[PDB]
Amino acid sequence: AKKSMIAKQQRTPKFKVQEYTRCERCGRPHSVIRKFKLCRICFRELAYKGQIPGVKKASW
Amino acid sequence: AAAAAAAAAAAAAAAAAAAAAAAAAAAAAAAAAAAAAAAAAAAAAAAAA
Amino acid sequence: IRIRLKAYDHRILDQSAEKIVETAKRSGASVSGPIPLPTEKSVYTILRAVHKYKDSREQFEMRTHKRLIDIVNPTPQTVDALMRLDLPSGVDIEI
Amino acid sequence: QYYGTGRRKSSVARVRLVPGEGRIVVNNREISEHIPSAALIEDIKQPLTLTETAGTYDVLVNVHGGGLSGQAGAIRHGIARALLEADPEYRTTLKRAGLLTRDARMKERKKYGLKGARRAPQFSK
Amino acid sequence: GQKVNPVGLRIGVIRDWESKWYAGKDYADFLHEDLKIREYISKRLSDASVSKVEIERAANRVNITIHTAKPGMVIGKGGSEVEALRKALNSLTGKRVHINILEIKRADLDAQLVADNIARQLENRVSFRRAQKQQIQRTMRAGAQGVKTMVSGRLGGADIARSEYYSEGTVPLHTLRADIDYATSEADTTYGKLGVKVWIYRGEVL
Amino acid sequence: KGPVAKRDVLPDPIYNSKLVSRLINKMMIDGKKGKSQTILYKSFDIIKERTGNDAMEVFEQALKNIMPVLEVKARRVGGANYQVPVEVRPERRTTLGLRWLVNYARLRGEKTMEERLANEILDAANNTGAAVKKREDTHKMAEANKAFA
Amino acid sequence: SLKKGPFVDGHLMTKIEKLNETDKKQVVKTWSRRSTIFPQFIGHTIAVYDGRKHVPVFISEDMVGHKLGEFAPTRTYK
Amino acid sequence: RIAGVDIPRDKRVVISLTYIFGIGRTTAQQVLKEAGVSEDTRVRDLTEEELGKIRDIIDKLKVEGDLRREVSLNIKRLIEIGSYRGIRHRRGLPVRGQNSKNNARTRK
RNA sequence: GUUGGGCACUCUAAGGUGACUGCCGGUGACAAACCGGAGGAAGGUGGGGAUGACGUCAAAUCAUCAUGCCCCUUAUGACCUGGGCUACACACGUGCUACAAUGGACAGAACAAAGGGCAGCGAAACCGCGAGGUUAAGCCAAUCCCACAAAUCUGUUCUCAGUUCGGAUCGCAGUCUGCAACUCGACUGCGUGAAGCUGGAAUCGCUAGUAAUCGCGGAUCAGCAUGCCGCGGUGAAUACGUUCC
């Protein structure tokens, strides 16, 4: 069950509280960041591949 | 305070010199002899007061 | 005429700052300079590992820094000069 | 109007030494009105006691940031800097006493997997 | 557990962003539009050997620059390539697209085209020594102070898969002013999936 | 590796001593010098009141009673567990005296550590006291094991 | 449910008021556990769906301030 | 003594009244504000007027056995009706909804 | 600091300069280097981060993804409601709160940093003991809001008890979020107040703005934080040494 669940999130449910955040590139909840609307590992991959214009390696 | 500190310190350094002499009797020749002589005389000097 | 540029790179924002600064300064508008305004930055800490290893993380950094430019005297020659400044997509002019 | 900046532990004080008798005025309040625990009051006075400056300048201080001992360090550092601006002479005395160092001991940044930038949670075998 | 990718490591030191704009209020929507763009363009021109795509966002306008290392497959007949490229993007994205196509002189220094050229040869069943050594000769004659190509997977040996390093010259991954091109590619063969990792120390910036 | 050294702050607004601020930094619970300074000055004011002396001299006299000449370290050779007597260098004499004052004061039990530390100083002055149990017992351990040095 | 009103589902309220407009009947198969017990429910043996079956419970004078799923534990233990 | 149970003579009034089953701190302060004892007296030192007011104020309030009998009625209520929360009351498992693979050591 | 005024000062964010054993003396082959000294905001990789070599454990991930091979297919696929992932006799890792006068409660005075806010942050006023409620200013934010920091300091009060310690658990009545808080949410109010009076064998963290302690913030998210990630506040004790693990 992957594309069915992605499709179910891409629907409009019965109630607004059934709406939950999801991947948009690599299908999974648990740690989809609201800002990027992206999964965590896919954020790490794309931010390594020079995309996602804000994030570089952090040090302070 | 003073006499007890002097007594215990002089006796511990005295046993240091004596054990250092008696562990090896013929080596690192003779500084231990002056050490034990001065320490024993100073122990008598401290106990005399 | 309170132009707030905000970008991710400081050098691109410097180019788009001094371009407005010079084009408005040359025609007498009494340009108060590129006032540097505090950056809003966000830190995203991420479990590096695919599956396990909560102790193994990696931190990413997004800095958006902004600078304020004010033009006080009207001088609409400067406004017609500002309207034709084509400066790139990095900086987000908002007058 | 001799002026000195003091920085300590994310606190910054602005010390202006006016010719007076020895009153220190922190944000329109006085010393024990704003700093209790008079070890900080005598320690905040150390640049004015090491070189003989005992009653020849009042001190006016504008402080912000940090906590009260951090503000104490910023005030005494700004005093030592403005008191160099008074006489450049006794820089050897202040420097042998410290007083131009700005202890850079900022509170350290927390690391991931640690509790408090050195703390490991607990190890069990 | 090993090395951080140097592409993601030198962003904001010397290597720029591919995707260059500033966020206004729909940053996520611009991101996922550009993911659909990059997927579509990498599918259509992963035959025509395009390495990298830089996207601008210019207030209803998008400047896409395309780095190919050959012009006349991508500018082509003049009309037809930029037409057939901009037309489906103007529809499936929803706004205006401008296309500027920069050509990479010295095609053997960009690690994406190098890793794809090694992957194709693995799909053409060229031996995994001939691919890497041939390509290392191509890069070291095209002029590079170091190249490292590492291929892993089932090499034609069934129940054990292992990694293979070949390299020439200095590839100093710890010097943070290095200008190293890193790139992955995949090669789906009958025995599974091979992974090509190429990174090219090309020269540093003072 | 090599030895590293430390520092400490010179005055106290009443009782201008180094070692009294050394006791202020001691007995600090959870980063509160304010509570330890209040406890300390109320205790030394009790020592100035209850015995008509300045509490500096009573406090140093108590220190002189507690500061141990001879620690006895360990030296395990084989299955022997020998203890070896060590002449304490006087920095550690002062710091073991301060630990024993602080620990046995708060270990006594009275209706403030003001009173507990004050009465522990008053006992270590007139040498019979709680930290001086540790002084006597360390000197007895060094006296029995003096054969090794 | 504080001052918005109490809560019941419209289908179970509909069925119970159909049951109360004439007379009582068999158990009411109701998947709703989330719904409070109104005092107009009293006497109605109703079948709460616990997760795998419909358990019949008979409602009294006391069983009002709670809900339906307090009267159907879902986990069997020893 | 007042509700059939003692209060200690040597405490203050606000907290000697706490030992009655049904009066904590804040109901004690609600009493002694109406009475006006100013919260600083022993209860070994009061007058019969000023303590009789304390007695009949506590007599108006639901304190000693009323509380026990009604809470026994509540426990018997959710024991008799069924009521999984009363199953938790009965069995020795936590009532308000609490995890039980760990501690839950007030109840067994 | 509201106005006018000023860029001095802090601050902010850009370009610099800046610390390199550079200079002195000593030791040491003359080297490399080391010890003390001077200057200096900074002294010997100044403090920290990011960076994790060849390889080891066929370590982990087919459940982020992609996947070779094998299997199911009107089902090992799909929808829907309901339950469960929160069970509970037990063990076991990590954590929170205490066992109390350096304490508890009450009142007064002050001091932060870092970060967030558009169908969002939400002032102020009013009501409610309180959780909160109604109307709503300003704010796409160095302005406005979150946001009244807390330990601290100073007074009042208790006086060493299973208590004016501690809050488990529990009854009743409430509040908010949201179709909906029964299993299974957080918070408040009243009442009840337990075990616990510093912990056996064993065992862990930390070398300085650290440990200890105190609050603050943000992700996630309608709502759920004692977890995590950062932030400041006060702020130590010790390092003789390499005998032992």
DSSP string covering G9-65 = -HHHHHHHHHHHHS---S-EEE---S-B--GGGTT--EEEE-SSSEEEE---SSTTS
Please report which helix (H) or strand (E) contains residue H16, including its range.
helix H13-16
Give CA separation, F65 vs F73, F97, F118, F125, F129, in Å: 21, 9, 15, 7, 10
- Sort out which chain G residues have CB atoms less than 8 A from H77's CB and list them: 62
A52 to chain C: nearest residue by CA? C62
Per-residue DSSP letters for E82-117? Answer: HHHHHHHHHHHH-SEEEEEEE--SSTTS-HHHHHHH
DSSP F12: -
Chains touching chain E, criterion 3+ CB pairs below 8 Å: A, C
Report the candidate in F82, F109, F98 with the shortest Cα–Cα distance to residue F134.
F98
User: What angle is formed at CA C13 by the lines to CA C8 and CA C18, rounded to 5 degrees?
Assistant: 175
Resolution (A): 3.5
Interchain CB distance below 8 Å, C90 and E20 = yes
Report the candidate in E99, E110, E80, E105 with the shortest Cα–Cα distance to residue E182.
E110
Give CA separation, H39 vs H11, H15, H53, in Å: 11, 9, 14
**Number of neighbouring beta carbons within 10 Å of residue A34:** 8
3+ Cβ–Cβ pairs closer than 8 Å linking E and C: yes
The residue type at A52: I
Strands (E), chain E: 52-55, 61-67, 96-102, 146-153, 162-169, 180-189, 192-201
Please report which helix (H) or strand (E) contains residue E80, including its range.
helix E79-93
Within 13 Å, how many C-alpha atoms sit on residue D68's CB side?
Answer: 13
Distance separating alpha carbons of residues C31 and C23, to the nearest angstrom: 10
Per-residue DSSP letters for H29-95? Answer: HHHHHHHT-TT-SBSSS--HHHHHHHHHHHHHS--SHHHHHHHHHHHHHHHHS--HHHHHHHHTS-S
Per the rule left: phi > 0, alpha: psi between -120 and 50, beta: everything else, C85 is beta
Q: Does A57 touch chain E (CB under 8 A)?
A: yes
A23 labelled as ligand-binding? yes
Per the rule left: phi > 0, alpha: psi between -120 and 50, beta: everything else, B24 is beta
Q: Dihedral of the CA atoms A21, A24, A25, A30 (nearest 10)?
A: 0
A36 to chain C: nearest residue by CA? C44
In chain F, alpha helices (H) = 18-25, 33-50, 55-66, 90-108, 113-125, 131-144
Distance separating alpha carbons of residues F119 and C77, to the nearest angstrom: 88
Three-state SS for F53? coil
User: Is E152:E161 a contact under the CB 8 Å cutoff?
Assistant: yes
Give CA separation, H46 vs H4, H9, H54, in Å: 19, 10, 10
Largest CA distance in chain B: 39
Distance separating alpha carbons of residues D73 and D11, to the nearest angstrom: 8
Interchain CB distance below 8 Å, H83 and G57 = no
Q: Dihedral of the CA atoms H83, H85, H86, H87 (nearest 10)?
A: 90
Chain C closest-CA separation from residue D118 CA (Å): 14
Backbone angles phi, psi at D117, to 5 degrees: 80, -10
Chains touching chain A, criterion 3+ CB pairs below 8 Å: C, E
**B36 CA → I195 C1’, Å:** 65
User: What angle is formed at CA F103 by the lines to CA F102 and CA F105, rounded to 5 degrees?
Assistant: 65
Q: Does C52 touch chain D (CB under 8 A)?
A: no
Distance separating alpha carbons of residues E180 and E203, to the nearest angstrom: 8
- Sort out which chain H residues have CB atoms less than 8 A from G43's CB and list them: none
Beta-bridge partners for G30: G48
Distance separating alpha carbons of residues F128 and F114, to the nearest angstrom: 20
Chain D closest-CA separation from residue C32 CA (Å): 27
Q: What burial letters (b/e) apply to F51-80, b meaning 16+ CB within 10 Å?
A: eeeebbebbebbbbbbbbbbbbeeeeeeee
User: Is F93:F29 a contact under the CB 8 Å cutoff?
Assistant: no
Backbone angles phi, psi at A41, to 5 degrees: -70, -40
A39 labelled as ligand-binding? yes
Q: Quote the crossing angle between the two packed helices F55-66 and F113-125, to the nearest 10°.
A: 70
Three-state SS for B10? helix
User: Is E197:E164 a contact under the CB 8 Å cutoff?
Assistant: no
3+ Cβ–Cβ pairs closer than 8 Å linking C and B: no
Interchain CB distance below 8 Å, F149 and B12 = yes
Q: Does A48 touch chain E (CB under 8 A)?
A: yes
User: Is E196:E118 a contact under the CB 8 Å cutoff?
Assistant: yes
Q: Which nucleotide C1' is nearest C14 CA?
A: I14
DSSP C90: T
Backbone angles phi, psi at D68, to 5 degrees: -70, -35
Distance separating alpha carbons of residues C72 and E148, to the nearest angstrom: 58
**Number of neighbouring beta carbons within 10 Å of residue H23:** 22
Three-state SS for C88? coil
User: Is C27:A42 a contact under the CB 8 Å cutoff?
Assistant: no
Method of structure determination: cryo-EM
Distance separating alpha carbons of residues C23 and B49, to the nearest angstrom: 98
In B4-33, the residues whose Cβ lies within 8 Å of chain F are 4-5, 8-9, 11-13, 15-16, 19
Within 13 Å, how many C-alpha atoms sit on residue A17's CB side?
Answer: 0
Nearest Cβ partner for C60 among A41, A53, A57: A57
Nearest Cβ partner for E19 among A35, A53, A57: A53
Beta-bridge partners for E193: E188
Backbone angles phi, psi at E15, to 5 degrees: -70, 130
**Number of neighbouring beta carbons within 10 Å of residue C83:** 8
Q: Does A60 touch chain E (CB under 8 A)?
A: no
Backbone angles phi, psi at F117, to 5 degrees: -70, -35
Distance separating alpha carbons of residues F85 and F72, to the nearest angstrom: 4
Place of tokens 């990413």: C60
**SS3 labels along chain D:** CEEEEEECCCEEEEEEEECCCCCEEECCECHHHHCCCCHHHHHCCHHHHHCCCCCCCEEEEEEEECCHHHHHHHHHHHHHHHHHHHCCCCHHHHHHCCCCCCCCCCCCCCCCCCCCCCCCCCCCC
Q: Does A50 touch chain C (CB under 8 A)?
A: no
User: What angle is formed at CA E10 by the lines to CA E7 and CA E13, rounded to 5 degrees?
Assistant: 150
Interchain CB distance below 8 Å, E22 and A24 = no
Distance separating alpha carbons of residues G66 and G71, to the nearest angstrom: 9
Nearest Cβ partner for F70 among B12, B16, B19: B12
Interchain CB distance below 8 Å, C45 and D113 = no
Interface test with A, best of C12, C44, C54 (most A CBs within 10 A): C44
3+ Cβ–Cβ pairs closer than 8 Å linking B and G: no
**F107 CA → I80 C1’, Å:** 69
Give Rg (Cα) of chain E: 18
Chain I, protein-covered positions (CB within 7 A) = 9-15, 39-43, 46-56, 58-61, 63-69, 77-95, 101-103, 110-113, 115-118, 140-142, 149-154, 157-160, 163-164, 168-176, 178-185, 189-194, 203-214, 219-222, 228-244
Largest CA distance in chain D: 67
Interchain CB distance below 8 Å, E21 and A50 = no
Give Rg (Cα) of chain F: 17
The residue type at C21: V
Give Rg (Cα) of chain G: 13
Report the candidate in D24, D87, D96, D85 with the shortest Cα–Cα distance to residue D60.
D24
Report the candidate in G53, G59, G60, G55 with the shortest Cα–Cα distance to residue G72.
G55
Chain D closest-CA separation from residue C90 CA (Å): 31
